[PDB]
Design a protein around this ligand. Structure first.
Ligand SMILES: C[C@H](C[C@@H](C[C@H](C[C@@H](C[C@@H](CCN1CCCC1=O)N1CCCC1=O)N1CCCC1=O)N1CCCC1=O)N1CCCC1=O)N1CCCC1=O
Ligand SMILES: COc1cc(CCNC(=O)c2nc(C(C)(C)NC(=O)OCc3ccccc3)[nH]c(=O)c2O)ccc1O
Ligand SMILES: [Mn+2]
Ligand SMILES: [Mn+2]
Length: 178
């Protein structure tokens, strides 16, 4: 293994690592080689999970972290029972409160740039978007941030802590270049 893989293993909890490996292998990437993508997958998974935790008990359905076939199955059930249009790309969550899918992004650039990229990619219009960065900023569709301030603040703090740990291991720089 590499230093990035050992860091990933000591940084994220093991269930997150396992789901990241699964998701990456399902697309033919090897966690032990494409280690930057491994860290990014772990970070994105943890953010999705903290986010779904931020709501009320029954509020969100978690799409991310399932195998692709089961993810689309759950998306189909949500669409067929709520009547919301089927997105073109797998979202990360479904909000039963606001009645909408959510795409979550975690970026090492400007939340503006990544938001524009994702919103050009989606084009299905009704899928809410919520971007976080590793510097503490966030941006969301209709400036509607879904959760209260405190849950988003916890996510932002975690992102900055991951950033610092990577820097202490001199892995932040190459990570920030992908
Ligand atoms: C005990 C607790 C663990 C965390 C786990 C949770 C993430 C998420 C995990 C799985 C489990 C469902 N599976 C397993 C395989 C098949 C399948 O469908 N997936 C993936 C797809 C959807 C889903 O549900 N969920 C959500 C509900 C319960 C659960 O497990 N969350 C949420 C916060 C951050 C985090 O990691 N939980 C559980 C709820 C409270 C909590 O924090 N611990 C131990 C100490 C640290 C810690 O967080
Ligand atoms: C193509 O490879 C991958 C593809 C997938 C499934 C489709 N893609 C995502 O579900 C997704 N992935 C990311 C990260 C940061 C992991 N990479 C990226 O797409 O950017 N961020 C997101 O917001 C997001 O929705 C899963 C894992 C991968 O490794
Ligand atoms: Mn996703
Ligand atoms: Mn996402």
């Amino acid at each position: 293994g590499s230093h990035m893989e050992d860091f990933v293993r000591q940084c994220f909890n093991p269930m997150i690592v396992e789901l990241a490996e699964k998701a990456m292998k399902e697309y033919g990437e090897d966690p032990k080689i494409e280690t930057n993508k491994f860290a990014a997958t772990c970070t994105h998974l943890e953010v999705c999970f903290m986010y779904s935790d931020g709501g009320s008990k029954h509020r969100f359905e978690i799409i991310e972290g399932r195998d692709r076939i089961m993810a689309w199955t759950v998306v189909n059930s949500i669409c067929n029972t709520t009547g919301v249009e089927k997105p073109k790309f797998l979202p990360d969550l479904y909000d039963y409160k606001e009645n909408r899918f959510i795409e979550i992004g975690v970026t090492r650039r400007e939340v503006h740039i990544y938001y524009l990229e994702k919103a050009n990619k989606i084009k299905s219009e009704k899928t809410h978007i919520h971007i976080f960065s590793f510097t503490g900023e966030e941006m969301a569709t209709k400036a509607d941030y879904t959760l209260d301030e405190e849950s988003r603040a916890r996510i932002k703090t975690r992102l900055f802590t991951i950033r610092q740990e990577m820097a202490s291991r001199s892995l932040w720089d190459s990570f920030r270049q992908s």
